[PDB]
């Protein structure tokens, strides 16, 4: 979504896990291999795809998860992450640049409970059905 403005001072997260999973156009789990500086207040995180749940913009290869990516973070301040640790990345995709991880991304360390939840969230439809 190439409608992420200048990096705000906000360095915090909001909403529920379900809320944010259904908001995010990209939902995956990975371990940070490396971190490299990027344009503006940005930072890239190099990862090796530990799991995937929603990838509605990546033409992932024939074999699933077990490939490398660079998540573009336009804010080095937050959401908090670390080199050499495992995380849950809920962000968006750019069908031009690969995965993007804007400041409205839900990032927390990878847990088995969370994994089993997001897997069930991809199986079930997002519970938000209006008229």
From Swiss-Prot:
Annotated S-S bridges: 7-75, 11-78, 22-126
Protein name: Procollagen C-endopeptidase enhancer 1
Location(s), subcellular: Secreted
Ranges for domain NTR: 7-126
Shown segment, full-protein numbering: 313 to 442 of 449
Role noted for this protein: Binds to the C-terminal propeptide of type I procollagen and enhances procollagen C-proteinase activity.
Complex and partners: Interacts with EFEMP2.
Record note on modification: C-terminally processed at multiple positions.
Known glycosylation sites: 120
